[PDB]
Ligand binder design. Structure first.
Ligand SMILES: [Cl-]
Length: 285
């Protein structure tokens, strides 16, 4: 029947080698381990992950393995075949994993495309074929940690993992956080696995997730003095001690302009939604 060692970690005995491979025996079958992965000696045991390659050969790898039967791993979509599903590269040598069309959206416009990213685990069927199973919301919730509430107006990459009529669920891989994009904050329907450049536009307290947009920042024309102050804030950590109550001397020493000119410039930045002020100074927002 089926080879229950496929897509699993095994300890096998190295029984032979050639210039390219160690040949590893386990339960009457021989698995080929690429020599370039590391040195071994014939007659010793070796631990690795057993699978089959695209040439139908039994393989073992000692490299780090991400997607297994028990653990999810990221894969890059390498090929779309409409009558089959999508192929994804999770880093198994000489093996890409098929995610079946039966677990992809019905609508082809929502399928992953080449270059998209999917978070999958492995399954072996009764014919010893490996397939990829998509993570669902609960898996992303287990992976991620609660978002922080100090990220407004930052941009981050965001990977689509779940599609709904109400909006798009995304994972932020640089941050290990979850977010959401309402339809009004994007253009075309995102596809499954699409990698987006998302801007933080709010914080959702109930589940500590980020509200995100794909829309451009508001166009806001700034006069020269306001632009000078904005560039200064961007270069000085988003903060300065100066505000509309500062002394003429301190304003002149830093910016070379009158207090009236400075107040007009801060007013322009306020109206443009770029700053806020309090007793401690002016903050970029
Ligand atoms: Cl809330």
């Amino acid at each position: 029947g089926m080879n229950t060692n496929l897509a699993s970690f095994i300890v096998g005995l190295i029984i032979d080698e050639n210039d390219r491979f160690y040949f590893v025996q386990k339960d009457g079958q021989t698995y080929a381990l690429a020599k370039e992965e590391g040195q071994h000696t014939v007659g010793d045991t070796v631990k690795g992950f057993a699978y089959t390659d695209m040439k139908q050969k039994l393989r073992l790898t000692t490299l780090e393995v991400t997607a297994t039967q028990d653990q999810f791993g990221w894969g890059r979509v390498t090929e779309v075949r409409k009558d089959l599903g999508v192929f994804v590269d999770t880093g198994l040598p000489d093996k890409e994993i098929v995610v079946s069309l039966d677990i992809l959206p019905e609508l082809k416009e929502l399928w992953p495309k080449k270059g998209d990213q999917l978070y999958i685990r492995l399954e072996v069927d009764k014919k010893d074929r490996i397939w990829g199973l998509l993570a669902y919301q609960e898996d992303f919730q287990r992976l991620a940690r609660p978002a922080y509430n100090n990220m407004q107006n930052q941009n981050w990459p965001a990977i689509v993992y779940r599609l709904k009529l109400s909006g798009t669920f995304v994972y932020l891989p640089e941050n290990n956080m979850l977010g959401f994009i309402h339809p009004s904050e994007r253009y075309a329907e995102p596809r499954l696995g699409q990698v987006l450049d998302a801007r933080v536009i709010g914080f959702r307290e109930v589940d500590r997730t980020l509200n995100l947009s794909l829309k451009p920042r508001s166009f806001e024309m700034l006069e020269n003095d306001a632009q000078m102050i904005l560039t200064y804030l961007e270069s000085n950590g988003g903060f300065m001690t100066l505000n509309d109550k500062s002394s003429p001397d301190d304003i002149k020493a830093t910016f070379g302009i009158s207090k009236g000119q400075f107040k007009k410039a801060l007013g322009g930045l306020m109206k443009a939604g770029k700053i806020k002020q309090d007793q401690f100074g002016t903050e970029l927002i």
